[PDB]
């Protein structure tokens, strides 16, 4: 069989991805509409968001939904939350760079229950449900087999919206570059997390992430054999936007490596 909420979510994600892909071939219609410090929100984001919300309301007119745009639309049954990013890495889309994904996760009683991310360009569908695992178009996902820092590929995002910590981040970057093999910088935390679940990157870390972006990936990597944490092993990440994740041994090595360079602001 299959998990029901997962199924309705993947239907929503399919529709949204098809809409985004269809609009991707007319860059004269989607404009750059900035919201904060280089966080564009184009009209296509609004359209995809509305499509997803409509598709959901058919099957759950009572579930409270969360969205970076519409804040928090309450529902008559607010024990279960629907966190959405209709588009991740808006910048990668405006530059028409074909690497982005829509992310839909459903939390139950606070604990994340199901998650999906969908890249329409490569047509890849990372699904994950707790107690059953993670799948990539039908293949199980056990993350990277790395157990050190050598030969390891580290995906990351830069605090290009919280540039005050830049130095700090860059500091640690240098430290990391003394032990790892190579970096990756794609521009969509959801897809980076997904890659962590697929072992295509030996780990990942980031500073300054909104609570509505990792919610679709943290469960992905969790049911993908990997683990997440704050920059110190705690769990305040859900509030600090500071994530470090990967297969367990690599996470341990990274934490022991980063704990010193860390500026005590994030602690």
């Amino acid at each position: 069989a299959m998990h029901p909420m997962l199924n309705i979510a993947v239907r929503a994600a399919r529709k949204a991805g098809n809409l985004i892909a269809k609009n991707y071939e007319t860059p004269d219609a989607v404009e750059a509409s900035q919201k904060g410090s280089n966080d564009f929100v184009t009209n296509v984001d609004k359209a995809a968001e509305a499509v997803i919300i409509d598709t959901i309301r058919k099957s759950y007119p009572q579930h409270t939904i969360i969205t970076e745009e519409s804040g928090e639309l309450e529902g008559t049954d607010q024990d279960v939350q629907w966190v959405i990013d209709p588009l991740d890495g808006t910048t990668n889309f405006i530059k028409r760079l074909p690497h982005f994904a829509v992310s839909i996760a459903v939390r139950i009683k606070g604990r994340t229950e199901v998650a999906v991310v969908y890249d329409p360009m490569r047509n890849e569908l990372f699904t994950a449900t707790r107690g059953q695992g993670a799948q990539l178009n039908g293949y199980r996902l056990r993350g990277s087999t790395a157990r050190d820092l050598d030969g390891t590929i580290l995906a990351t995002g830069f605090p290009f919206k919280a540039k005050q910590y830049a130095t700090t981040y860059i500091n640690i970057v240098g430290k990391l570059f003394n032990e790892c093999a190579d970096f990756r910088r794609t521009g969509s935390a959801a897809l980076d997390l997904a890659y962590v679940a697929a072992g295509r990157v030996d780990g990942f870390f980031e500073i300054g992430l909104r609570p509505w972006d990792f919610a679709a990936g943290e469960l992905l990597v969790r049911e993908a054999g990997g683990i997440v944490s704050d920059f110190t092993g705690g769990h305040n990440y859900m509030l600090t936007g500071n994530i470090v994740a990967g297969n367990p041994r690599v996470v341990k090595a990274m934490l022991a490596n980063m704990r010193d360079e860390l500026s005590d602001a994030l602690k």
């Binding site: 399919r14 991805g17 098809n18 892909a21 269809k22 991707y24 071939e25 329409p120 047509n123 178009n137």
Partner: protein
């Protein structure tokens, strides 16, 4: 090739397509369904519009660039109906229905036309070609719009024309419809300067004598009274004053020659630089460099082909440009 480009699929979902070939005999796959070949569109209108299939509004032609744009022309046999109100339908939703079904594949329901000229003209769905020059030996015609809408006529990536050429089969040409179009046929009568500068006082008298070309006025002006007797308006004092004005005209041709050799831009910022004589200025602008920044906008590979410019000379010259521009980061 048979799939749409961006039509994402997933094992478990149903899709629609047209069975374009069956192979019960071949040693492998025996059923061949496509979704790109144009007849699909045709048959899909069959399954959509209750007119087509009832043989009242038959689909004549349909050209298609997948997932991007599909032009379609249909004729009607009963004058009771027309495509815009029934084949487009109410509020244009049936074509919208098939569009959404084929993944936002925009469609151009163009009213078929049987006059090959007007046929290829209408098949240009968003356009207005107010100047047609029809020819069949080459299939090409001046099919273009007023200056400014040329993008709106060719459409993105040539679609709005690449389809019509695919649809009409007649090769197409899109240059202009108001400017630059008489140049194809009304080119010897469109030189507004001299003819009207002589006509402003002739508007009381008459037009000018077209039965001789007189474009090459020099020789054909040395014709006897015959030409001057046959036609009126070009009086003898008129011909003599106009010969003085044609002295002004040949001097004007020489002066235009002089002016056409003015955009080379030898400036101090472009002349005194190391290894730069005035002839280096003339050479660098002989490729089209009318400023100093442009010199700093090319590499040795691209500033090549110059008649007497090696790789090290142009190298140090690019270096000088990038010093005066990008190394000191100044102007």
């Amino acid at each position: 090739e048979d799939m749409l480009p961006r039509e994402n699929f997933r094992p478990g979902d149903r899709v629609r397509g047209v069975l374009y070939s069956v192979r019960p005999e071949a040693r492998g796959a025996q059923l061949f369904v496509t979704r790109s070949k144009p007849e699909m569109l045709i048959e899909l209108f069959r399954i959509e519009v209750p007119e087509i299939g009832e043989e009242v509004i038959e689909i004549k032609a349909a050209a298609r660039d997948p997932g991007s744009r599909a032009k379609i022309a249909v004729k009607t046999n009963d004058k009771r109906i027309d495509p815009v109100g029934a084949c487009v339908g109410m509020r244009g939703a049936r074509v919208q229905a098939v569009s959404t079904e084929l993944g936002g594949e925009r469609i151009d329901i163009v009213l078929w036309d049987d006059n090959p000229a007007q046929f290829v003209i209408n098949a240009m769905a968003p356009a207005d070609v107010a100047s047609i020059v029809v020819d069949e030996d080459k299939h090409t015609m001046d099919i273009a719009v007023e200056a400014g809408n040329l993008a709106q006529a060719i459409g993105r990536n040539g679609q709005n024309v690449r389809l019509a050429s695919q649809l009409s089969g007649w090769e197409l040409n899109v240059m202009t419809v108001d400017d630059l179009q008489a140049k194809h046929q009304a080119e010897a009568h469109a030189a507004i300067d001299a003819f009207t500068k002589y006509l402003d006082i002739d508007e009381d008298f008459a037009t000018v004598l077209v039965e001789e070309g007189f474009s090459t006025l020099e020789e054909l002006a040395y014709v006897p009274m015959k030409e001057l007797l046959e036609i009126e308006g070009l009086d003898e004092p008129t011909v003599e004053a106009l010969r003085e004005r044609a002295k002004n005209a040949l001097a004007t041709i020489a002066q235009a020659q002089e002016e056409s050799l003015g955009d080379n831009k030898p400036a101090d910022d472009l002349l005194n630089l190391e290894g730069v004589d005035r002839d280096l200025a003339f050479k660098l602008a002989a490729r089209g460099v009318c400023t100093l920044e442009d010199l700093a906008e090319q590499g040795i590979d691209d500033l090549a082909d110059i008649e007497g410019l090696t790789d090290e000379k142009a190298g140090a010259l690019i270096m000088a440009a990038r010093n005066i521009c990008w190394f000191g980061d100044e102007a």
